[PDB]
Amino acid sequence: FNKITPNLAEFAFSLYRQLAHQSNSTNIFFSPVSIATAFAMLSLGTKADTHDEILEGLNFNLTEIPEAQIHEGFQELLRTLNQPDSQLQLTTGNGLFLSEGLKLVDKFLEDVKKLYHSEAFTVNFGDTEEAKKQINDYVEKGTQGKIVDLVKELDRDTVFALVNYIFFKGKWERPFEVKDTEEEDFHVDQVTTVKVPMMKRLGMFNIQHCKKLSSWVLLMKYLGNATAIFFLPDEGKLQHLENELTHDIITKFLENEDRRSASLHLPKLSITGTYDLKSVLGQLGITKVFSNGADLSGVTEEAPLKLSKAVHKAVLTIDEKGTEAAGAMFLEAIPMSIPPEVKFNKPFVFLMIEQNTKSPLFMGKVVNPTQK
């Protein structure tokens, strides 16, 4: 439900398939939305090919969609993700660190803080260790201690760095009971298991088995404007599941509101994803902004400039209840027939969607819960 939603979904997938390709034995978790928003904001300080590469690498076809529509699209998205009276409890931030002694262009600083409500700071890159400390302290402080020592090192000639972080710990509209959480096996291989805390509940879930995706598909809503979608592939269908996913298929799932009884087993976990955006977005065609040929004339008017560092960290916590604050009670009418046992006890894929815009807030893959 947003002009740029289709683009963000395409970006989420190209990014996902990129990461899934590098290796299939690691947990994947990232925010298509936080990354795309950061880079769209950055493009504002770039021009020509440098600029164009960035928007195209974010899956926007400049021959078909006007730039003004792109930014307004991100604007509406932001005005939604962070509103007063309503909170999905999303801790996110984007920090720009530019060399002191650089003559920055006002308009850029205005756009960053006013339009994309982001943060720009000036630091002394002459002192690498102190620069790193300030950057890391920024993240730590923004996540109240959940993300520490993010940046492990800086290039010798670093003059501009970008940090993008996001932490999500949502509250289910229909929570699990802690007393029902017990240790269960999780099949990493078809012949190997490992124990992990497993949440479980008998109720009416928006769950179904999809022939095309060869997977079970579960949708659960979070307090706020978000919805989690879990895809459990049949035996040997993970790769098929990954290839067959599409924005149209996901939109269809979100339209369905049918519920059926089931005994659901869902792992209680905490996973993280840390990526070097220069490397990852590089594989998506975004290379000039990170090179000596970078046209960042919208950032600094007279001196050479390029983005030498760009990091993204996404943290997800899934548990029985997002808070100790008991939620209002409700009663579901569960039939007396035998409910299917649907267990997320093997590699599965997931996506978190923002209900209004339908933007892909998060996307990931759990290969082994006890991996972190």
Side-chain angles (χ1 to χ4, degrees):
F1 210 88
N2 185 301
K3 220 306 183 197
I4 73 166
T5 279
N7 304 278
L8 294 162
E10 287 319 304
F11 173 67
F13 298 136
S14 62
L15 194 45
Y16 180 90
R17 284 157 181 153
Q18 168 71 65
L19 296 175
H21 228 184
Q22 302 184 186
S23 87
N24 247 195
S25 63
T26 298
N27 288 330
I28 295 171
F29 186 70
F30 68 96
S31 181
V33 167
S34 77
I35 295 167
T37 290
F39 274 70
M41 179 216 72
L42 175 62
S43 70
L44 287 183
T46 67
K47 305 187 190 163
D49 306 325
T50 296
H51 169 276
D52 289 347
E53 270 198 340
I54 293 174
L55 303 187
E56 298 175 325
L58 297 179
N59 289 261
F60 292 99
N61 185 332
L62 308 178
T63 71
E64 298 170 302
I65 190 177
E67 285 181 23
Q69 303 216 314
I70 298 176
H71 298 296
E72 61 89 32
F74 281 105
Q75 261 106 257
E76 276 307 77
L77 185 77
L78 297 192
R79 293 158 182 159
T80 296
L81 299 189
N82 60 283
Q83 282 178 298
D85 210 35
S86 307
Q87 43 192 171
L88 175 59
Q89 219 54 71
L90 195 65
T91 293
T92 190
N94 193 75
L96 293 190
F97 294 86
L98 289 160
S99 162
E100 71 182 13
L102 269 183
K103 190 189 171 180
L104 309 177
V105 177
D106 286 302
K107 190 75 185 72
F108 179 62
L109 302 191
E110 294 163 40
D111 292 323
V112 171
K113 300 165 192 179
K114 183 168 179 182
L115 287 184
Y116 286 78
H117 303 70
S118 211
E119 297 169 83
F121 297 99
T122 184
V123 295
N124 172 30
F125 280 120
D127 186 331
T128 304
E129 291 285 325
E130 188 57 21
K132 185 168 74 158
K133 171 152 189 312
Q134 293 165 302
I135 288 171
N136 292 342
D137 288 346
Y138 159 76
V139 181
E140 192 180 306
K141 170 200 200 161
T143 65
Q144 299 300 227
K146 190 60 163 75
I147 295 171
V148 294
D149 214 41
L150 177 64
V151 181
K152 295 300 184 306
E153 55 179 47
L154 291 180
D155 282 317
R156 169 90 170 189
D157 73 327
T158 308
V159 294
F160 180 25
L162 180 162
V163 161
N164 186 267
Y165 69 88
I166 189 162
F167 169 86
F168 180 67
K169 179 184 174 185
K171 295 176 290 189
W172 297 121
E173 287 200 345
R174 314 192 183 203
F176 290 89
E177 290 179 41
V178 182
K179 76 155 172 301
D180 295 315
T181 296
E182 54 207 6
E183 292 297 298
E184 294 191 28
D185 290 329
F186 190 105
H187 300 247
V188 291
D189 292 77
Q190 287 198 49
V191 306
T192 316
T193 55
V194 168
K195 311 293 206 182
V196 305
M198 189 79 66
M199 304 178 311
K200 71 181 167 302
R201 171 158 80 83
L202 173 54
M204 303 301 287
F205 291 100
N206 178 162
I207 187 169
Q208 49 271 115
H209 194 283
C210 175
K211 256 169 164 191
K212 173 145 42 170
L213 300 187
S214 285
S215 313
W216 276 97
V217 185
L218 165 70
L219 285 77
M220 291 193 306
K221 304 181 191 158
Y222 285 115
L223 272 313
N225 48 294
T227 300
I229 316 181
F230 301 89
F231 310 82
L232 182 74
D234 292 332
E235 274 199 299
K237 299 281 174 177
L238 171 58
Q239 187 70 64
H240 174 76
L241 191 218
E242 294 176 326
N243 301 347
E244 302 295 307
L245 279 178
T246 68
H247 184 228
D248 187 54
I249 279 165
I250 281 139
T251 297
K252 174 175 180 176
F253 283 125
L254 296 167
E255 305 184 322
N256 170 251
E257 301 279 67
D258 293 323
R259 284 174 189 279
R260 74 135 146 313
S261 67
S263 282
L264 170 69
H265 292 55
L266 182 77
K268 167 177 178 158
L269 69 212
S270 193
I271 62 169
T272 66
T274 303
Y275 306 94
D276 171 2
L277 298 173
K278 174 178 187 185
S279 171
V280 169
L281 305 180
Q283 301 302 286
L284 292 180
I286 305 182
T287 79
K288 272 189 175 176
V289 78
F290 300 109
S291 83
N292 297 324
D295 190 329
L296 278 148
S297 64
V299 181
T300 207
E301 211 154 304
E302 297 300 75
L305 185 59
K306 73 173 165 184
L307 186 59
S308 30
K309 199 80 188 322
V311 192
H312 170 67
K313 183 161 193 196
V315 179
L316 165 76
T317 288
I318 284 303
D319 64 9
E320 297 85 353
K321 283 176 51 166
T323 181
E324 301 174 294
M329 302 194 306
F330 60 87
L331 299 181
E332 309 181 321
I334 304 159
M336 43 191 302
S337 85
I338 281 300
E341 197 173 69
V342 187
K343 299 188 172 192
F344 284 76
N345 64 358
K346 64 187 179 165
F348 66 85
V349 174
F350 74 83
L351 212 23
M352 282 92 193
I353 307 296
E354 196 276 315
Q355 286 168 21
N356 294 308
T357 65
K358 300 185 155 41
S359 305
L361 278 170
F362 300 108
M363 192 174 182
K365 196 203 340 199
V366 177
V367 175
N368 182 4
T370 38
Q371 182 228 84
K372 181 170 171 169

